[model samples]
Target: ATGLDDPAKKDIAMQLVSSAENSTLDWKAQYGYIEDIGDGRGYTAGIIGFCSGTGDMLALVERYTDRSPGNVLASYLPALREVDGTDSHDGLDPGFPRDWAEAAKDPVFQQAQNDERDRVYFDPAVRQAKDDGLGTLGQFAYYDAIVMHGGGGDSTSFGSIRQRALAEAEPPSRGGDEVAYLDAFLDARVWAMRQEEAHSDTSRVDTAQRVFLRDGNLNLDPPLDWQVYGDSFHIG
Candidate 1:
C-alpha cells in the first residue's frame, strides 16, 4: 500500500465509502422544478439533467468531490476504474499535479466568491425563513485541502495526514471579513476536498486535482495556506 495502486489496501477503502457508515440516507423522488422546466427545443435550453434517485446522489457526489476530497470515498467505491491513467477518477497512484499545488493559492478569492454566494443565495434564504419562523436548512457547507504525500505517511490515516498539512500551513490569503463568511459554508466544500485528498493519496478515488485550482483560487501570486480542517467523517 505504499504507492496508490496497492490492491489489498484499496479493498478496505472501497468498503468504507460505500458501506452503511456513509451511504445516503435521504432518498426522495421529486419532479423538475422551475430550474428544470423549459420550452421544447428538442432539448431544453436550461436542462440541468434528468436522473433516477441514485443518479441524483451520484451527481451531488461529483459536484462536491470536485471541490472537496472527503466526499470521494463516500461517493465512489475504490473498485471503480479510471478510464485512462490521465482521465480516470479511480487511479489510486495518481500523484498530485503541480498545477494543483500552485492553484491552491486562490482560497483568498474563493472566500470572496463564496461570500457572494452567501449574500445572494444563502443569507437571504436563511433570513427570510427565520423571519417567518419556518424550519429551514441553513447554508451549510464544508471545504479543505492537503498534500498527503509530503506528510511523511501513507493514506488512510486522517489524523496523521491532517497534522502534517496543518504543521506546514501558511497563512490564508483572505482578510478576517472574507474568512468569516467562508467559515459558514466551509463544511460542505471541505468535505468534498478531503474526499479529493483521500482519492489523490490512494489513487483509488477519481477526480482531477486541476479542479481545485480551476474552481478554487488558483492564480494568486503568493499561494494561500489552506490547512486540513479535521477528520472527514466528523461532519455527519
Candidate 2:
C-alpha cells in the first residue's frame, strides 16, 4: 500500500509539515502542544493542530473516549461539540485547555491523534498522490494541503484543489511532466490559502514546497533545505 511508513519518507514529511505548522522540525515533541491562535479554528492542538472548534478535535476526543472511557478528556466532549464551528469557548473554560495538554501525554491520546490524522488527512492524500503517479514530494504536497485545508469534499478541500489542478494539467500518471503537474497543484493550493486571512502567508508554499519543486526534487530525496515564514530548515 502507498504509505508514509517508510522511515526516510516519514521523517521528511513530518519535518516539512512541522516547519509549516509549528515553525520547527520537532513534531514529536508537539504532542503536548495546545493554543488558541485566534484563527477562528479554535484551539489548535497536538501535532497537526486539530482544532477544538473544528469537528476533527471532537472526533479525536470521541475516539479517545471510546478507547479509554474515563480518560480525563472525556468530559470535554460536550464542550468540544458545543464549540464546533465557532471560536467561542462557551463550555470549555477553566480546565479544558489544561486537560487537553495533559491528555497529550497519554499514549492513548497520542495514538488517537495519529489515528485521526491518518484517517482524516495523511492516508487519503498520499494514496491519491501515488495514484496520480506522483513521487514523495508530490505526495507530501498533497498531504500538506490536506492537512491545512482539510480533506472534506467541499470546494476548499483537498479533493477540490486536486480537481482544479487536473483541469489545468494532467498528473504524471496521465503522461504529464511531474514538475508541471506539481506546480499546477501548488498553484491551486496557494489560491486556496489566500482565501483565508489566517492562512494568507504563502511562504509555506513559495519558500518551502515550491522551492523543492523548482529544484526538481521529484523523488523528494534529501539533503533537503527550505524555509517557512522566513525560518530555514534542513534535513539530510
Candidate 3:
C-alpha cells in the first residue's frame, strides 16, 4: 500500500490527505493507498469520496475544478489510477522492490489465491446455496459459510446467480431452507433486469451516455439506438 513513508511519493500524498481532511464532501472512505506497479513504476495515494450510486461520484469529480485540491489529489494519487484499471490489480514496474515484485508475480502465490478462493468461497455447499430473495451480499454469506466449513462444489454459474440474486432481491429470511424458492425468484428477477437493461436509455447509446462528455463529443447523431434527452436542452 502507498503510504506517507516513502519519501519520493509522500509529498503528493500528504497534500491529498490534507485536502481530504478539509473538504466539505462527505466521504465514506477518506483515503486510499497505491502500489508501485512493476517495471520501474512508482506508487501513489488517492483520496476518495464515496457515493451510493454508480454515476454520481464520477460526475462530481468532473464538475470539480481542475486545479481544486481534490482534483489535484486525484491527479497525483496512484490509488485513483489503480481503481480505474479493470483488472483491479496494479501493474509491476522495474524499479519496484525486488522481493515484493517476485512475491507478487510468483505463480505459486497466484495459485494459492485461486486455491483459497475455491476453498473458501467456491466450495460445493456455497455453490448449492442459491437464493433469489436474498441479495448479492446475502448470497456471499452462504458462500462464506461453505468456505468456513471447508467444502462444496465449484460451479460458477450457480454461485454467480446466488450472488446476483442477493444483490437484486430482499434480505434473506433467517430461518429454514428457503434457498430453492429464492433461487427461482432470482432467476426471474435476473431475466427481467436483463430485458429492461437491453432497452434502457444509457444501454442503447454507444457514446456520451452521461451529462458531461469529458472529450466534448456531445453531438447526437440520428439513427441512434437510444436517446435520453433532458428537458433542459437549450434550443437554438
Candidate 4:
C-alpha cells in the first residue's frame, strides 16, 4: 500500500504538487486557470497546467471534444494545433481564454482534466518509480519532476533526468541504496531545472524534497512540512 495509488498517499501527492504548481493545496480550484504566464508556453491551464504550446493541452482538448463534441474548447482545436510547440496565439486570443473559462465550469471538462492528469503524468510516473523499486517518496519525486519537466526526450525531460541519475547511482531495482538513488535523481532534476531560466529556482528541490530525503521520510508521512519560494506549508 506504499504505492501512491493508495488513496491517502494520493491526496498527499496532490497537495504536494499543488503547493508547487498552484502555490496552494486546493488543486481543484485550478480548472479555470488559463494564462500565457509569458513563459513561452501559451495558455497554461487546468489541474495539470496543460500548456497550449505543449501537445498535452492539444491532446486534452481533443479528448474533451471526443466526450462531448462541439464543446466550448472544441472550436479552438485548429488554433491549439497551430500554436503547438511555439507560444503564438495566432488562432487563439480574445475568445479562447473566455471559452476556456467557460469550459472549466463543466463537470465533463473537469473529469477530462482528471483523466488526462492520471493517464499522462501521475500514473506513468508512479509506474516507473515502482518499476525502479522505489517507495512512496520516490514515487512522488518522479511525479513532481515529470509534471514540471515533461516527458520530452530532451536534456531536461523526466527520461533524461532519470538517465543522468543512472550514471551516478543505481536504483533499488538494481540493488542500490534507495536514498542515494533518490539523491542522484533530485540532483539531476535540479540540473535540468537550472537549464531553463524560468525554472532556475531550485528551492523546490533544496528546501522541500531534500529536506524530506535528509529526514529519512521515505514514506512521505506527515505532518509533512516544507516550503516553496520562501513560503511555509505543513500538512498535519
Q: For this target, which candidate reaches the highest TM-score against the unseen true structure?
A: 4
Question: How high is the lDDT of residue 27 in model 2?
Answer: 86
lDDT of 4 at 73: 87
Q: Rate the local accuracy (lDDT) of all candidates.
A: 0.27, 0.86, 0.32, 0.92
Candidate 3 regions exceeding 4 Å error are 1-107, 123-236
Give per-residue CA lDDT, model 1, range 1-236, as digits (tens).
Answer: 22111343222222222222123111111111111123221111101221212132233324434665553223232322222122223332242222222222345323333343333333443343233222211111110121111112444233343333333431133222323333322332344347546542321122212222334432211222211222122111
Per residue, candidate 2 scores C-alpha lDDT tens digits across 83-194 of 9988888788888889988898899899988888888888888888889999888999999999888877788789899999999999989999988889999999998888
Give the range where candidate 4 is weakest over 10 consecutive residues by summed lDDT.
Answer: 195-204
| Candidate scoring better on lDDT of 1 and 4 | 4
Q: Which prediction has more favorable lDDT, 1 or 3?
A: 3
Query: Which parts of model 1 have CA positions greater than 4 angstroms off?
Result: 1-104, 136-236
Instruction: Flag regions of model 4 displaced more than 4 Å.
Output: none
Alpha-carbon deviation at 72 in model 1, angstroms? 29
Instruction: Give residue 90's error in model 2 in angstroms.
Output: 3.5
TM-score of 1: 0.19
Question: What tens digits encode model 4's per-residue C-alpha lDDT throughout 103-198?
Answer: 999999999999999998899999999999999999999999999888888888999999999999999999999999999999999998988766
